[PDB]
Design a protein around this ligand. Structure first.
Ligand SMILES: Nc1ncnc2c1ncn2[C@@H]1O[C@H](CSCC[C@H](N)C(=O)O)[C@@H](O)[C@H]1O
Ligand SMILES: Nc1ncnc2c1ncn2[C@@H]1O[C@H](CSCC[C@H](N)C(=O)O)[C@@H](O)[C@H]1O
Ligand SMILES: Nc1ncnc2[nH]cnc12
Ligand SMILES: Nc1ncnc2[nH]cnc12
Lengths: 257, 268
């Protein structure tokens, strides 16, 4: 909460999206697995519409690489100004931007439509209309007079809720909050840490609520979703690096009813 | 008649061939643009990928004829051959390949090509692994002159006869006339085992191209002239496709009208 005031974007990108965790060459890593989950889901053709909002974007864009060709209006979000700034640098191809090209390349590989990674990035940059503040702890996470088209046809969120909640109940409530952003029938792609209790972001040490796959499932059900898919990636030893105590990564494809 | 004159002219002209300018001319945009699938680059890689994808072209040893300063022509090939020989007439080109082999920063950057080849091969291979494997499998870089009856010389280092040949934009670019071209095709053919395969890529109806100061005179050939030459040398033509160069890609770096890709198997 106040702890997020020390959160360092570059340290976070370093710890999670640079080697080893960010190596994409080996298909058994967390990176390729996450991209794979995202791509397979959209390749189904069942997740579609006009508008999409990414909840708790942080300083990362990989979570939208497969989504962007299915949604012409995209809203990115985060609670921190610094994350939003870091997003801006990439979206505007400004100097010092993080280099997401490995991931863009990999989404292209996985998707298998012969697309060059540059076309992929252009499209993503083209369809992201706005980068907005957000606080999942608020009943109206986006605020009141949001420039964001509501309700969204679809939601994405990776490593936010559990990462910003002290306990299960808070986790459950935050999920309720963002769900009100989602149109009935809409879709939610939720990615997150399993059985994690802390992670580091430079000088920031974040407290995390440790959640299990069944708990995530139950929270989704409790929030009014049908769970279409819930998969688990177990974190191999060589990717336990001192930056957290994550045990695994869950991917959930839920649909609002 | 006498082949020494024409060959002498060609050797004289190539002394001015500039690898960086040539690379810039043909492998940087717009000709190098890999994003448009209708562009020449994507078409070349695609011809190679699909040929190797048949699984019908394999063995232990491969020789790339007239490599120049480029490696793209081996990207799809390298997963099918343990031992690859690269070759060029010009030391400056050989040095260029040397820089890429050592993975120096000053080396020309081929990774867009490596990536694109990974993309269309469709095995989810990252481009660093593809590159890593090409570097490992290139066992030597050798001088060569396709006009000599033994293009690699006598007692060459190369494992002979090779199981397969690749050759991109070499023969026509160094043969003053059709007979020269034919003779050259004959010479490289002696390097290949019977039943082996040759993958030939080249310019169609081109009479000149630029490589810096060097402006080289090319023998313009047609698809049919190419086919007959392959037959004349002892090959069965398995595949001969043509790409017509788009007007927007005719940049004044040459007068190429199109590009040919031949898949030929040496009779035996
Ligand atoms: N109260 C709150 N409401 C909404 N987002 C918050 C929040 N407190 C912190 N965040 C954001 O939650 C994110 C967790 S990490 C960033 C995750 C990123 N989506 C990726 O996939 O790697 C951080 O960007 C953090 O700034
Ligand atoms: N007499 C000869 N015998 C064999 N190769 C020759 C030659 N004279 C010039 N060459 C080489 O023929 C090449 C033509 S350029 C094509 C290079 C590369 N294979 C490509 O795909 O882009 C030049 O590298 C040139 O140095
Ligand atoms: N909080 C976290 N823990 C483990 N892996 C992550 N990847 C992104 N955020 C993470
Ligand atoms: N000499 C040449 N002419 C036309 N296109 C080429 N691509 C590579 N070399 C070429």
């Amino acid at each position: 909460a106040s702890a997020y005031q020390r959160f360092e974007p570059r340290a976070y990108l370093r710890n999670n999206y640079a080697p080893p965790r960010g190596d994409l060459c080996n298909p058994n890593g967390v990176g390729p697995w996450k991209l794979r989950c995202l791509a397979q889901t959209f390749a189904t053709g069942e997740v579609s519409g006009r508008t999409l909002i990414d909840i708790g974007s942080g300083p990362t864009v990989y979570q939208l690489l497969s989504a962007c060709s299915h949604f012409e209006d995209i809203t990115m979000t985060d609670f921190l100004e610094v994350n939003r700034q870091e997003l801006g640098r990439w979206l505007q191809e400004e100097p010092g931007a993080f280099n997401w090209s490995m991931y863009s390349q990999h989404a292209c590989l996985i998707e298998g439509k012969g697309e060059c990674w540059q076309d992929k990035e252009r499209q993503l940059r083209a369809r992201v209309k706005r980068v907005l503040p957000i606080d999942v702890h608020q009943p109206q996470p986006l605020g009141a007079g949001s420039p964001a088209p509501l309700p969204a046809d679809a939601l994405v969120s990776a490593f936010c809720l559990e990462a910003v909640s002290p306990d299960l109940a808070s986790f459950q409530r935050a999920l309720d909050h963002i769900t009100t952003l989602l149109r009935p029938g809409g879709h939610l792609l939720l990615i997150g840490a399993l059985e994690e209790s802390w992670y580091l972001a430079g000088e920031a040490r974040l407290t995390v609520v440790p959640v299990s796959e069944e708990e995530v499932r139950e929270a989704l059900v409790r929030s009014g979703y049908k769970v279409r898919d819930l998969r688990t990636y177990i974190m191999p030893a060589h990717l336990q690096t001192g930056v957290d105590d994550v045990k695994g990564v869950f991917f959930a494809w839920a649909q609002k009813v």
